[PDB]
C-alpha cells in the first residue's frame with residue numbers, strides 16, 4: 001500500500017523549519033522505537049547454576065506453553081546402551097534441560113524490551129494515549145538528568161530499597177510463560193517438586209490423586225534388543241512417565257487436593273541490580289548529538305548479539 | 321505583474337498505446353486456499369458481484385490491433401489456466417478392484 | 419512497434435504508436451499474498467483487491483498492481499523521478515468485459531484494458547502566471563488605457579536563468595499537458611528582443627482600480643491622486659499603519675520571515691505613442707492596435723494620418739470641432755489654444 | 765536527475781502563526797498563513813479498533829484503512 005503511493009508522488013519544498021529540530025518529533029520518535037526497552041547490570045557476573053530444572057507447576061503436553069521448548073520427552077524406543085548422562089548431563093528425563101547458551105560465565109548485563117513486568121499502574125484496559133502519558137510521567141519522576149532509574153523503581157527482589165514504583169515482582173507461574181526472563185533475572189532458584197525422594201521425603205512419611213507423589217523411582221535404567229543393537233530397542237526409564245495425567249503438578253499448585261510438595265531455595269545473585277532506560281537516554285542524547293545519530297547508535301546496541309531484541313516476540317525478548 | 325502556478329507543466333514528445341487482457345478463474349484460487357464447497361459458493365458470489373457492476377456501466381470500443389485468439393501467449397496461457405494438471409490413464413485391458 | 423523500447427527512436431514524430439502484441443496476465447499469478455492465505459481470510463483479501471481495481475477504472479486511472487515496475491522502467495529507460503510523472507498522468511479505457519464460464523461453484527471472466535502513456539520531452543516545475551496591468555494616458559482630453567501584447571503566458575525560473583514560455587493545445591490530467599511549448603524573448607526596441615503590438619482603448623473618468631495582493635501590499639492604478647500615490651502610472655503600495663485610501667481600508671501587513679526568492683525581474687522599456695492617441699481610440703469605440711515596441715517614428719505616424727485628416731471642419735458642428743482643435747493644440751502652442759477656445763465660446 | 769518543486773515556496777517570504785486560534789484575528793488580510801509547528805501523529809495511537817482485535821482480523825482491518 002505504501003509503495004504504490006510513493007510511486008506516483010514527486011517531492012515538494014514546504015517553507016517551515018526541519019521536523020528534526022522540533023521537541024514533539026524527537027519525543028514521539030524515541031517512544032515509538034524504545035518505550036519499553038531496559039538494560040540491567042548484575043553486581044558481578046554469576047550464571048544460573050544447574051543444567052536441570054524441576055518445575056512441576058507448569059502443565060505438560062498431552063494452550064501451548066513457552067517452557068515446552070526445554071522439555072525432555074521420555075521415549076519408549078532408544079538405541080543400545082543409551083543413558084541420559086551421555087546427552088542431557090544430570091537432568092531428570094521428563095523434566096526440563098537449560099542449554100549452555102542461557103548459562104554463559106562472562107555475561108554481565110541483561111537487555112530486554114517488553115511491557116509484561118510493569119506493576120499495577122499499567123493496564124491494557126486503559127487507552128494507548130493514557131498508557132503513554134502514565135509511563136512518560138513515571139520515567140520523568142524516577143530519573144534526574146541521566147538515564148539510570150532510582151532504586152525505588154525496582155521490585156524488592158532486585159534491591160533492598162525497591163518499592164515496585166515501575167516493575168512488579170516475578171512469581172512462581174512466570175517460568176512457564178517467560179522462561180529466559182526468570183533464568184537471566186531471578187536472584188535465587190526455588191524448586192517445586194512432587195518427586196518421591198526430594199528433601200528425604202519417603203513414601204511412608206506422609207503425616208482421585210489425593211496424598212501421592214507424581215513420579216516414583218524405579219530400580220535402574222536399562223535397554224534390551226533382539227540381535228539389532230543399533231536403531232530400535234525398548235528403553236526402561238529410572239522414573240515414571242506423566243503422559244496419562246499431565247495436569248498433576250499444575251492442579252496440585254492451585255490446591256484442588258492436598259499433596260507432599262517440596263520447595264528448596266538456592267542463592268544465585270546479590271540483590272544490588274542497576275537499571276538504565278533506553279527511552280530516557282534517546283531523549284537526553286538527542287538534545288546534544290541530534291536524533292539521526294542517536295537513533296542509529298542505539299538501534300545497533302539492540303543488535304549487539306546478532307538478532308535485534310525489539311523484533312523478538314514480546315514474552316521471549318530477554319538477552320544476556 | 322505575476323502570481324504562482326504551483327501545478328507542473330509537461331511537454332508531450334509522443335504517446336505509447338498498450339492492450340492488457342486480465343483473466344480471472346475462481347477454481348485456481350479455491351485450490352490453493354484449500355476452500356470447502358460452502359466457501360466456494362461465497363468466493364463465486366463475491367467475484368460475480370464485483371465483475372458484473374463494472375460490466376454494467378462500460379460500453380464496448382473497437383481497438384485497431386489483431387485478434388488475441390491468433391496470438392501464441394493467449395493460446396498458451398488459456399490452455400494452462402484450464403488443463404494444466406489434467407491427465408488421462410489407459411489400462412492394458414479393463415480389470416476392476418476385486 | 420515490435421517492442422516498448424522502440425518508442426525512444428530519435429527519428430519518430432509526435433503521434434500515437436501502439437505495441438503490436440497484447441499483454442496476457444492471470445490474477446492468480448499476480449496476487450502472491452492470497453496463495454499462502456486460507457479459508458475466508460483468502461476470500462476477503464481478494465474482495466478488497468477487486469473492489470480497488472473497480473474504483474480506479476471508474477476514474478479512468480491505471481491500477482499498477484497487474485504490471486511489473488522493473489520491467490516497464492527497464493523498457494522505457496527512464497529515471498526514478500520521470501517514472502513518477504509518467505505513472506501519475508497515464509489514463510485507462512475498459513474496451514470489453516466477458517464472463518467465460520458460470521457454474522454455481524465456479525466462474526471465469528476476461529477484461530480488455532487499453533492504456534495511453536504520455537512520454538514527456540521536458541518537465542517545468544517553478545512557474546509564474548502573467549497578469550497584464552498596463553498604463554493610463556490622458557490625450558487631447560480623452561483618458562485611454564494602453565497595454566502591451568506579450569508573446570508568452572508563463573515565466574519559468576529553475577535556478578538562475580529566467581525563461582519565457584508560449585504554450586499551445588493544453589489539457590489537464592492532474593498536471594497541465596501541452597502539445598507545443600515555444601521559448602520566446604521579452605518585448606523591446608532592439609534586434610535581440612521581440613517587436614510586440616501595443617493596444618489602446620478609451621475608458622470613463624474617473625478610473626480607479628485597487629487589487630489586494632496576498633503578501634499584504636496593494637496594486638493601484640487610478641486617474642486621480644490619494645495618500646501621496648502618483649496618478650496614471652501603476653504601483654505596488656505598502657503602509658506602516660491602517661488608513662483609508664480610494665474609499666477603502668489599506669491595512670498594515672503581518673511581519674514575515676525571509677526565504678530564498680524565485681521572483682522574475684523583466685527588462686525596462688521606453689515606449690513612444692502617437693500625439694493624438696486619445697482621438698484615435700475614441701472614434702473606433704473598440705480596443706485598437708496603435709504601434710509596435712520597436713517601430714520607427716515615420717511608420718508610427720503614417721498609420722492614422724489619412725483617417726485623422728478626414729475628420730475635417732463641417733457646417734453642422736464648427737463649435738464642437740474648434741474645441742477639439744484647441745485640446746489637440748494646447749501642449750504644442752498654448753497661445754493659439756487660448757485663442758481657438760475663445761472663438762469656440764463666441 | 766532528481767525532481768523537487770518550489771511551487772509552494774516561490775515568493776521568498778512566509779507569514780506564520782503560533783496557534784490555529786490566531787487565524788480569526790480581525791486585523792489580518794486575505795492571504796496564506798502557515799501554523800509554525802508540525803502536527804506529529806502515530807497510526808497505532810489513532811486506530812483504537814485494531815488494538816483490541818487479534819490475528820488476521822487485525823491485519824485485514826488495517827488493510828481496509830490504508
Ligand SMILES: *[C@@H]1O[C@H](CO)[C@@H](O[C@@H]2O[C@H](CO)[C@@H](O[C@@H]3O[C@H](CO[C@H]4O[C@H](CO[C@H]5O[C@H](CO)[C@@H](O)[C@H](O)[C@@H]5O)[C@@H](O)[C@H](O[C@H]5O[C@H](CO)[C@@H](O)[C@H](O)[C@@H]5O[C@H]5O[C@H](CO)[C@@H](O)[C@H](O)[C@@H]5O)[C@@H]4O)[C@@H](O)[C@H](O[C@H]4O[C@H](CO)[C@@H](O)[C@H](O)[C@@H]4O)[C@@H]3O)[C@H](O)[C@H]2NC(C)=O)[C@H](O)[C@H]1NC(C)=O
Nearest residue numbers: 322631633634635654656671674681682683684685686777
Ligand atoms: C509583495 O511582493 C512584491 C513583489 O511582487 C514586493 O515588491 C518587490 O520588493 C522587492 C524587495 O524585496 C523589490 O526589489 C528591490 O528592488 C530595488 C530596486 O531595483 C531597481 O533599481 C536598482 C538600482 O538602480 C539604480 O542604481 C543602479 C546602480 O546600482 C543603476 O544602474 C540604476 O540606473 C539606478 O540608478 C537596480 O539594480 C534594479 O535592476 C534590476 O531589476 C530591473 C527590473 O526591475 C532589471 O531591468 C535590471 O536588469 C536588474 O535586474 C537584474 O540584475 C540584478 C542585479 O543588478 C539582479 O538582482 C536581477 O536578478 C537581474 O538579473 C532595479 O532597476 C533594489 O534596489 C533592491 O535591492 C535590495 O536587494 C539586493 C539583493 O537582492 C541588495 O544588494 C540591495 O542592497 C537591496 O537591499 C531590491 O532588489 C522589488 O522591486 C519589488 N517588486 C515589484 C514588482 O515592485 C513587495 O515588497 C511585497 N510586499 C510585502 C508586504 O511583502
Ligand SMILES: *[C@@H]1O[C@H](CO)[C@@H](O[C@@H]2O[C@H](CO)[C@@H](O[C@@H]3O[C@H](CO[C@H]4O[C@H](CO)[C@@H](O)[C@H](O)[C@@H]4O)[C@@H](O)[C@H](O[C@H]4O[C@H](CO)[C@@H](O)[C@H](O)[C@@H]4O[C@@H]4O[C@H](CO)[C@@H](O)[C@H](O)[C@H]4NC(C)=O)[C@@H]3O)[C@H](O)[C@H]2NC(C)=O)[C@H](O)[C@H]1NC(C)=O
Nearest residue numbers: 157169170171172175182186188189190199261262263265
Ligand atoms: C523466581 O523468584 C520468585 C521470587 O520473586 C519466586 O517466587 C516465589 O517462590 C517462592 C517459593 O515457591 C514462594 O514462597 C513460598 O510461598 C509458599 C506459600 O506462601 C503462603 O504460606 C505462607 C506460610 O506457609 C505465608 O507466609 C504466605 O503469606 C502465603 O500465604 C510457602 O508455603 C513457602 O514456604 C515454605 O517454603 C520455604 C522455602 O524456603 C520455607 O522457608 C518455609 O519454611 C516453608 O516451609 C517449607 O515447605 C515446603 C513445602 O511447602 C517444604 O519442602 C520445606 O521442607 C519446608 N521448610 C521448612 C523449613 O519447614 C514459600 O514461602 C513465593 O511466594 C514466590 N514469590 C512470589 C512473589 O510469588 C520464583 O519461584 C522463582 N522462580 C524460579 C523458577 O526460581
Ligand SMILES: *[C@@H]1O[C@H](CO)[C@@H](O[C@@H]2O[C@H](CO)[C@@H](O[C@@H]3O[C@H](CO[C@H]4O[C@H](CO)[C@@H](O)[C@H](O[C@H]5O[C@H](CO)[C@@H](O)[C@H](O)[C@@H]5O)[C@@H]4O)[C@@H](O)[C@H](O[C@H]4O[C@H](CO)[C@@H](O)[C@H](O)[C@@H]4O)[C@@H]3O)[C@H](O)[C@H]2NC(C)=O)[C@H](O)[C@H]1NC(C)=O
Nearest residue numbers: 607608688689690691709710711712713714715716717718
Ligand atoms: C524605437 O527606437 C527608435 C530608435 O531610437 C525610435 O526612433 C527614433 O526616435 C528618435 C527620438 O524621437 C529620433 O531622434 C531624432 O533624430 C533626428 C535625426 O534623424 C535622422 O538621422 C538619424 C541618424 O541615425 C536617422 O536614423 C534618421 O533616419 C530616419 O528618418 C528618416 C527621415 O524620416 C527616414 O527616411 C529613415 O528611414 C529613418 O526612419 C534621420 O535620417 C534628429 O533631428 C532629432 O533631433 C531632435 O532631438 C534631439 C535630442 O532631444 C535634439 O538635440 C535636437 O535639437 C532635436 O530636437 C532626434 O534626435 C529618431 O529619428 C528615430 N529614429 C527612427 C529610425 O525613426 C522609436 O521612436 C522607438 N519606437 C518606440 C515605439 O518607442
Ligand SMILES: *[C@@H]1O[C@H](CO)[C@@H](O[C@@H]2O[C@H](CO)[C@@H](O[C@@H]3O[C@H](CO[C@H]4O[C@H](CO)[C@@H](O)[C@H](O)[C@@H]4O)[C@@H](O)[C@H](O)[C@@H]3O)[C@H](O)[C@H]2NC(C)=O)[C@H](O)[C@H]1NC(C)=O
Nearest residue numbers: 634635654655656657658659660669670671673674675676
Ligand atoms: C519602507 O522602506 C523602508 C526603507 O527605506 C523600510 O525601512 C527598513 O525596514 C527594515 C525592517 O526590517 C528595517 O530593519 C530593522 O532594523 C532595526 C535596526 O536598524 C539598524 O539595522 C538595520 C539592519 O537590521 C539597518 O538597515 C539600519 O540602517 C540600522 O543600522 C532592527 O531593530 C529591526 O529588527 C529591523 O532589522 C530597516 O532598518 C529599515 N531601513 C531604513 C533605511 O529605514 C520600511 O520598513 C518600509 N516601510 C513599509 C511601510 O513597508
Ligand SMILES: *[C@@H]1O[C@H](CO)[C@@H](O[C@@H]2O[C@H](CO)[C@@H](O[C@@H]3O[C@H](CO)[C@@H](O)[C@H](O)[C@@H]3O)[C@H](O)[C@H]2NC(C)=O)[C@H](O)[C@H]1NC(C)=O
Nearest residue numbers: 349350351352353354355451452453454455456457459460
Ligand atoms: C493447504 O493444505 C495443504 C495440505 O495440508 C497444506 O500443505 C501442507 O503444508 C504444511 C505446512 O507448510 C506442510 O507441513 C510441513 O512439511 C514440511 C516438509 O515435509 C516439514 O518439514 C514440516 O515439519 C511440516 O510437516 C505439509 O508438508 C503440507 N502438506 C502435506 C500433505 O505434506 C498447505 O499449506 C495449505 N495451504 C494454505 C494454508 O494456503
Ligand SMILES: *[C@@H]1O[C@H](CO)[C@@H](O[C@@H]2O[C@H](CO)[C@@H](O[C@@H]3O[C@H](CO)[C@@H](O)[C@H](O)[C@@H]3O)[C@H](O)[C@H]2NC(C)=O)[C@H](O)[C@H]1NC(C)=O
Nearest residue numbers: 063116123124125177314315813814815816817818819822
Ligand atoms: C493478547 O494476549 C494477551 C495474553 O493472553 C491477552 O491478555 C489477557 O486478556 C484476558 C481477557 O481480557 C485477561 O483475562 C481476564 O483477566 C481479568 C483480570 O485479571 C479477569 O477478571 C478475568 O477473569 C480474565 O482472567 C488476561 O488477564 C490477560 N492476560 C494475562 C496474561 O493475564 C490480550 O487480551 C490479547 N490481546 C488481544 C485479544 O487483542
Ligand SMILES: *[C@@H]1O[C@H](CO)[C@@H](O[C@@H]2O[C@H](CO)[C@@H](O)[C@H](O)[C@H]2NC(C)=O)[C@H](O)[C@H]1NC(C)=O
Nearest residue numbers: 296299300301302303304305306307308309311
Ligand atoms: C545484526 O547483526 C548481524 C551480525 O553482525 C548482522 O548480520 C550480517 O548481515 C549482513 C546483511 O547484509 C550480512 O552481509 C552479513 O554476512 C551478516 N553477518 C552475519 C554473521 O550473519 C545483521 O545484518 C544485523 N541486523 C541489523 C538489522 O542491523
Ligand SMILES: *[C@@H]1O[C@H](CO)[C@@H](O)[C@H](O)[C@H]1NC(C)=O
Nearest residue numbers: 045100103104105106107108
Ligand atoms: C571469559 O572471560 C575469561 C576471563 O577474562 C576468559 O579467560 C575467557 O576466555 C572468556 N570466555 C569464556 C568462554 O570463558
Ligand SMILES: *[C@@H]1O[C@H](CO)[C@@H](O)[C@H](O)[C@H]1NC(C)=O
Nearest residue numbers: 196197198199200201202264
Ligand atoms: C537429608 O537431608 C539433608 C539436608 O541437609 C541432607 O544433608 C542429607 O544428605 C539427607 N539424607 C538422606 C539420607 O537423604
